[PDB]
Amino acid sequence: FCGKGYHLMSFPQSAPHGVVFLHVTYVPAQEKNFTTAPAICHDGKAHFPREGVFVSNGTHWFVTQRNFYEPQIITTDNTFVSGNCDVVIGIVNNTVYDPLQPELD
């Protein structure tokens, strides 16, 4: 609506019978080609992303923001559980990290 692509803001500029809008919009540009898992299966618990999408370069799975590649390690802190793995169409087995364990000293 406000220009093309994901709108940030606009400015008015006057014109002799009208207005010019400058639209500032985000456009994503370079990209990659990867596999996405619909969900991750852990120890029977399915896990789902709290915000993003699961992605992988093949060595390991990573959860990333939808609109700019910035991986982080999949963990309890960034995924939520929802029942067993068996219900999902094509779930993939992995660990889920959990931050707690180094604190158990």
Ligand X SMILES: *[C@@H]1O[C@H](CO)[C@@H](O)[C@H](O)[C@H]1NC(C)=O
Binding site for other proteins (CB under 8 A): 3-6, 8, 15, 17-39, 46, 48-49, 53, 55, 64, 66-69, 80, 82-83, 87-90
Give the integer Cα–Cα distance in Å for 55 and 66.
10
The reply to whether 103 sits near a copy of itself by the rule CB under 8 A is: yes
The item of other proteins, a copy of itself, ligand X, none sharing an interface with residue 59, based on CB under 5 to 8 Å by kind, is ligand X
Give the integer Cα–Cα distance in Å for 13 and 23.
11
The reply to whether 86 sits near ligand X by the rule CB under 6 A is: no
**9 within 8 A of 16, measured Cβ to Cβ:** no
Tokens 């094509």: give the residue: 90
Segment interacting with a copy of itself, rule: CB under 8 A, options 29-37, 41-49, 54-62, 96-104: 96-104
Give the integer Cα–Cα distance in Å for 20 and 10.
10
The reply to whether 81 sits near a copy of itself by the rule CB under 8 A is: no
- Taking the complex as a whole, the smallest distance from the CB of residue 98 to other proteins amounts, in Å, to 19
Other beta carbons within 10 Å of 100: 10
How many residues does the structure list for the chain?
A: 105
Site residues for a copy of itself per CB under 8 A: 100, 103-104
